[PDB]
């Protein structure tokens, strides 16, 4: 009955893992040699990265 006003705090804990952002056109794991990694754009030309 005498409950006080309140807010909500949300967080997630993930331990023991690595975030992964695969270099694929649709993020799927279709092979060891990712399809976008052999695309002509990123195979012949050289690009900077930020």
């Amino acid at each position: 009955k005498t409950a006080v006003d309140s807010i909500t705090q949300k967080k997630f804990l993930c331990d023991r893992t690595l975030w992964r952002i695969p270099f694929s056109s649709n993020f799927m794991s279709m092979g060891a040699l990712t399809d976008l990694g052999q695309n002509l754009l990123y195979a012949n030309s050289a690009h900077a990265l930020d």
């Binding site: 002509l40 754009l41 012949n44 030309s45 050289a46 690009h47 900077a48």
Partner: protein
């Protein structure tokens, strides 16, 4: 290294202007055979020679219901339904059937630009045109005979663009 089987040079793109920036030897895909004997070393040299042959050659040789714009649209000229027009007497309420006039609407929708462009190059054409270039005997000429396109800080008209102004 060797002036006959050289590691290729790979161009760098500048997306923003559309021109091609300076290039450089490929430095991310080298093979480290420094722990191999003459057999595998000759094999690897032959492989790099094969790669160079592939590059040179490639470069040199290889350089009703109109679709509208992805969703087809039908086309009618005499589809005029509401033949009335409001003269002094009539009073036409809400109406309107959107129909593309064959000549006026469609042609006006698919005209190109007024005058074609003259400037930089898009991404696809850059990929098709600027393959990695194999430089056989590097810098073997007198000064001024070198390929200046390779240096990114070099401007074609005004030579040797001073960085930092």
């Amino acid at each position: 290294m060797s002036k006959e089987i050289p590691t290729p040079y790979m161009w760098s793109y500048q997306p923003q202007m559309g021109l091609a920036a300076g290039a450089a030897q490929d430095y991310s895909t080298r093979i480290n055979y420094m722990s191999a004997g003459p057999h595998m070393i000759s094999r690897v040299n032959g492989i790099r020679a094969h790669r160079n042959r592939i590059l040179l050659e490639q470069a040199a040789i290889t350089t009703l219901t109109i679709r509208g714009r992805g969703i087809q649209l039908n086309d009618e000229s005499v589809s005029s339904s509401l033949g009335l027009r409001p003269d002094g007497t009539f009073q036409i309420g809400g109406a309107g059937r959107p129909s593309f006039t064959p000549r006026q609407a469609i042609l006006t929708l698919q005209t190109s630009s007024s005058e074609p462009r003259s400037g930089g190059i898009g991404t696809l054409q850059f990929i098709e045109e600027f393959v990695p270039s194999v430089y056989f005997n590097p810098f073997s000429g007198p000064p001024g005979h070198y390929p200046d396109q390779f240096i990114p800080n070099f401007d074609a008209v005004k030579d040797s663009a001073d960085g930092y102004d």
